[model samples]
Target chain A: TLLGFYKQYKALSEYIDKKYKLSLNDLAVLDLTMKHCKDEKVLMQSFLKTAMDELDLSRTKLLVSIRRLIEKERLSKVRSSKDERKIYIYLNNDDISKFNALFEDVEQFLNILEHH
Target chain B: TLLGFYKQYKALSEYIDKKYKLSLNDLAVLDLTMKHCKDEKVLMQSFLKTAMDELDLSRTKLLVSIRRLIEKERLSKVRSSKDERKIYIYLNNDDISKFNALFEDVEQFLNILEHH
Candidate 1:
């Protein structure tokens, strides 16, 4: 089960790497979203602010990164209230599992890389 | 054997994420190094030049990202010939297995993620 998950992540990363031409900042944003906001719908403004504060990234950088993730369907967004214009970001439940699986695969890879 | 390797990779990624606070660029550089230059001791100058052209990253960005990977011992550098000053980057053989293992795990994970 675990190895299966890892393999899935590797393929996804390769696809994203090739198709999106994702940069380090884009990857960092994805990683952060996977790590911090996997379970909840986060307000885009607040999420961006917090991400910037923690990662020391600029608004433009975050926007670009997040947009790519959204485009890839790894994340989803919607208005907070029907009448309001605020946007919120959240991982697709399916994507959350994918991300977690990928994380596990990464961990295993590093373990072997460092030790073996 | 594959599953065991994936589990190992997961643990290592957590450690690096916590200790190094690696950004997306760092991840990209690491990923690229792992994907493209894992088998050869590529010259650093040329590598950087090519990477910048491919990734549209600046020298400073590449330096910072690569430096973090080096500090983590994910990569190693040595001067070419005793009289020369050129540096080369190559994946440690031990680390290559780890990376390959992780790649496998990620592939598996994505497969399941997309399907399940």
Candidate 2:
């Protein structure tokens, strides 16, 4: 079963790395941001701290993925107006499509595995 | 689906790490060695080289996992008598069940996802 997932992951991983130069870990970070932050207060520190713990990623690895996402312009960081020190990330309309494409691509790959 | 896989991978990764001090990548290495090496002259160099390519793993990482597998006594290396320079790995009776448990555990985890 994991081998099944591994096959798809390796294939899609090569796809992502080739097209976007991003890792699957970065996709996980983006997925969390896109879904979990809708009208909710998902702070950068707490959110990613939890991501590193829950996703079993190290700080440097997680931080580097975040940086790559931002550098790719698929992600944006913001300081809260009320509390300037508190930071969060934002995804505009184009970014929503961009990330939506990534997850939905996984959905397509899931179909591949389902049949296999 | 990748998220579902991620959830299980992280959980099983933690479980394996805590119990065996290994990574999911190592599991992939072990899995390939088990299934692909049966009566088929599977040389370690060729096997791991293909693994790193297909699995998108680095050389050092793959080598370390092999070393760890050897150190754990779950794997053993042998020099071919005909070609003394050529090397391969062997999994004894106990090692088979040991690796079998891992793949079977993944099978069980697969059932969990199928229902979910």
Candidate 3:
């Protein structure tokens, strides 16, 4: 089941790359952020540490990747309630819509593959 | 782009497992058959050899899996024109429909995930 999930995720990732020009690391970090902070926003530092540990990327690389995502508007930063000086990152409505659109395209392709 | 494809494939694989009770190897073989032999039927032995090398499965394992697929009606054997004694393997229309259905389910779930 986990492997199956990975396969579908991979398919969507490929579709995204073809359409959006995002890299593997960019997708991986985005996935991590989505899974961990989908329901609730996460502190920026906390997310950074977790992402660095899980993705095994250098801090500079991870930071740069996250920054790029922010620039692309796939990730957004908001002030943390507990710490006014601290920020949190999470997927916004537009990002979620884009992600869903990717899956829809994949589904359509699968349909075409089946018909042919 | 390749990695992205893998990600989407992985996601579909996950959806299939959750819904269809298929394993990773089963999915892999099916995918291989779909890609390499989808257009034109492939000789059974030829498919077995290629599958064995690509999937790194024992002959016994591969044979057993292929037999299971045949029994499941996902794969069909047809007599080859070049050699009466040889048979070629291919995916049937039903199996293709099933695979496509799996992708559609994944697309729907992704849509729900986005809306929520």
Candidate 4:
């Protein structure tokens, strides 16, 4: 079930990478929606319905992990640009180079799978 | 190869969900790490290494999708209790009802993959 998603995600990421060189979180979001949501309508409906709950710890930790990873690479910072209350995250050019390397690593892994 | 990882990811998810009824994002995190990381040490290292890379947009879009799913179901909020700066996510009962429906749909999809 996930292989299908992975193939599509990799394909989509490659497309986006070729075009906009989208941010990591942006790529992550695309992968999430493409795999889980049936359509935009379903996604919008879901979002509107759950506007008042707390963040899941697992997710928090996971985001933190991602942030920590970026920090280690000296690639980006997590701060809110629009709202000082929120943490808006983005990667700089240096970070993108490292991220691209990691992405290449992932691509290599996936390519090996196809060949193997 | 992706299927192998999916099987493991799903297995781990079921185990965690059964024990904790993990939020959608929590489940998403497990799915992300299990598929992407070779091992715990690898994951930790990846985290450390990429600590500075900005969130790849693909990944961000994906998390937002999960958040939107919970939001639509009215199952949770995106606020954090521990860090005011962070948006913590959790699923409430109402949101879970919708999320469970979505999850069941996914499980059914996976089962079909296995049987067919």
TM-score winner among the candidates? 2
lDDT of 1 by residue, B1-116 (tens): 33333334444455446645654456567777976787788888888888877665679889988887778677788888867877888898876766566556544544444443
Q: What local distance difference test score does each model get? A: 0.67, 0.76, 0.68, 0.43
> Residue B46 of candidate 2: its Cα lDDT?
88
Which runs in model 3 stand beyond 4 Å of their true positions? Answer: A1-18, A80-84, A103-116, B1-116
List model 3 lDDT by residue over A7-72, tens digit each.
444454455578767766786787787778775778878988998887667788888888888888
User: What's model 3's overall lDDT?
Assistant: 0.68
TM-scores vs. true structure, each candidate:
0.42, 0.74, 0.39, 0.30
Give the distance in Å from residue B27's predicted Cα in candidate 2 to where it truly belongs. Answer: 3.1
What fraction of the native alpha-carbon contacts across the interface, defined at 8 angstroms, is recovered by model 3? 0.06
Please compute the TM-score of chain B alone for each predicted structure, in the order given: 0.66, 0.74, 0.64, 0.37
Tens digits of per-residue lDDT, candidate 1, A1-116, equal 33333344444445446755664456567777876677788888888888888666689889988988788776778784775777888887887886677556654554554332
Tell me how each candidate scores on DockQ against the true complex: 0.05, 0.45, 0.06, 0.03
Error of 2 at A8 (Å): 2.5
Query: Over the true interface residues, superposed, what is the Cα RMSD of model 3?
Result: 9.2
Tens digits of per-residue lDDT for model 3, B11-112: 544665777666555656766788776678788889978877766567887787677667767667888667477888887688788656754665576554
lDDT, model 4, position B59: 52
Misplaced by over 4 Å in model 1 are A1-21, B1-116
Superposed model 2: Cα runs more than 4 Å off: A38-43, A49-61, A80-84, B35-43, B46-61, B80-86, B113-116
How far in Å is the alpha carbon of B110 misplaced in model 2?
A: 4.5
Interface RMSD values for the candidates, listed in order?
11.4, 3.0, 9.2, 8.6
